[PDB]
């Protein structure tokens, strides 16, 4: 998107490998290297999910 | 404010919450002195004195049991009518240990909740 | 005094020489009668300031007359009045005037004057029991003084359908005090 080194930075998150990812917008603003949550890659379902990229 | 926005305490709307749907308003009206619930179900529904502390006298087992039974039975009375799965009615206060009690009733009462 | 009519005809009526005016009374009304010529005379006297009544079929010779109306229109010539009697001993809504004299205090010496947002006095003394002309003027006037409700000074019939401290009549600088 409109890449603006302004606390506005786009990122994703793997599925422990579940394989690929899924969309997400972000803001250093707070918690830098902070970013985790679960989902479900083509890999079965669910799976921890770091976001960092 | 509108009648229900200047007084205080109630939540009636947290009743209408379940109103939407789910089943009978297994509404359980309390007053320590005893417990009394009906069964307001959708459509200008009604009720069937399913369980009351007086209906069968008020016994002498306090909270505990009372409920334990009032409910059960209640549940008994109804499932004779032709209900089945009825939605609970915290009528008021938080599913206090009373409440919870009665509650049991239903459940044990076999009237799914 | 007299005034007739009561059918169902306001336009033409409301026209010519006869002005509308309902037959209003506690419990019953009856088509508008009267006339645009009587209103004159009498009204001219002092509508809701004294009182009389007219003989329509000798029907019911009673008082109360007007409790509303208006010369409304732009022109300033009334049309469509209200009429209500009172053969009861309940007479309340009684608004009769009150006059001073000129007592010399701020005027004929200080030139100063005085506003009288009052003048009238809607009260409720002894029903069918009021002096068409009641006067009360303890005098006083000038500088930054003022008098209103509160003080006043009511005779006989102890009503006051009104309140205290409020638009009585003070003395202001017609130029400077």
């Amino acid at each position: 998107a409109k890449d603006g080194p302004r606390i506005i930075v786009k990122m994703e998150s793997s599925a422990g490998t579940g394989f690929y990812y899924t969309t997400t917008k972000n803001r250093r603003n707070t918690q830098a290297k902070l970013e985790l949550k679960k989902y479900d890659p083509v890999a079965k379902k669910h799976v921890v999910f770091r976001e960092k990229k | 404010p509108m009648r229900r926005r200047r007084e205080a305490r109630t939540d009636y709307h947290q009743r209408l919450r379940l109103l939407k749907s789910g089943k009978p308003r297994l509404v359980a009206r309390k007053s320590n002195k005893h417990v009394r619930a009906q069964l307001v179900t959708p459509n200008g529904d009604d009720t069937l004195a399913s369980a009351h502390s007086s209906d069968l006298a008020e016994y002498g087992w306090e909270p505990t049991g009372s409920a334990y039974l009032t409910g059960l039975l209640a549940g008994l009375r109804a499932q004779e009518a032709g209900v089945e799965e009825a939605v609970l009615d915290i009528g008021l206060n938080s599913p206090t240990p009373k409440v919870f009690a009665i509650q049991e009733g239903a459940i044990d009462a076999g009237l799914d909740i | 005094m007299e005034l007739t009519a009561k059918p169902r005809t306001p336009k033409q009526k409301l026209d010519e020489s006869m002005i509308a005016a309902v037959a209003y009374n506690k419990e019953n009304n009856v088509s508008f009668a009267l006339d645009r010529k009587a209103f004159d005379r009498a009204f001219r006297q002092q509508s809701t300031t004294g009182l009389f009544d007219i003989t329509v079929e000798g029907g019911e010779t009673f008082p109360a007359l007007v409790k509303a109306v208006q010369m409304d229109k732009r022109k300033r010539a009334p049309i469509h009045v209200d009429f209500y009697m009172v053969t009861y001993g309940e007479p309340v809504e009684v608004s009769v005037p009150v006059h001073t004299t000129g007592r010399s205090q701020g005027e004929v010496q200080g030139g100063l004057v005085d506003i009288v947002v009052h003048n009238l006095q809607i009260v409720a003394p002894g029903p069918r029991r009021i002096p068409q002309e009641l006067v009360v003027d303890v005098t006083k006037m000038n500088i930054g003084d003022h008098i209103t409700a509160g003080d006043i000074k009511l005779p006989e019939g102890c009503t006051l359908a009104a309140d205290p401290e409020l638009t009585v009549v003070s003395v202001l600088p017609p130029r400077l005090t």
């Binding site: - | - | 732009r74 300033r76 005037p97 009150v98 006059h99 001073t100 005027e107 030139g111 004057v113 005085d114 506003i115 009288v116 003048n119 009549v169 017609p174 130029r175």
Partner: protein
């Protein structure tokens, strides 16, 4: 009836600049007064004035009361020329709704004040109506 941009964005919230209401003196009955019939964004200024000159010629007792007061206004030449016209304000008043209760020459027997107001009408602008009130003028 073109009127203004708003009561606080263009020009709304003023004192309008004038010379207050009441004058003359009391009076319970005597109904002595003035009103109109003409419609016109009563020329403030012209207004303010007028009425005043009224006191100028009398002085004291005669309800030099007056029930008027402008409160909105026009606008015109300021900027380019004639086209896309922004707006520069000036001259507020109030609509004299085709006649109505003007100002009052109210008092017992004091025509010495009736003539006054009279002098007051003369002035004014939109013709004016010379009149009396409930009862007349004594």
């Amino acid at each position: 009836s073109i009127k203004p941009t708003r009561r606080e964005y263009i020009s709304g919230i003023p004192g309008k600049g004038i010379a207050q209401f009441k004058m003359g003196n009391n009076t319970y009955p005597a109904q002595v007064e003035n009103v109109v019939e003409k419609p016109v964004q009563i020329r403030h200024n012209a207004l303010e004035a007028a009425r005043n000159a009224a006191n100028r010629f009398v002085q004291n007792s005669g309800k030099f009361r007056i029930r008027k007061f402008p409160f909105h206004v026009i606008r015109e030449q300021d900027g380019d020329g004639m086209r896309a016209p922004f707006g520069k304000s000036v001259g507020t008043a109030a609509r004299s709704h085709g006649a109505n209760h003007d100002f009052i020459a109210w008092v017992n027997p004091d025509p010495a004040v009736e003539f006054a107001w009279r002098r007051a009408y003369m002035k004014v602008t939109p013709t004016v109506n010379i009149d009396s009130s409930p009862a007349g003028n004594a």
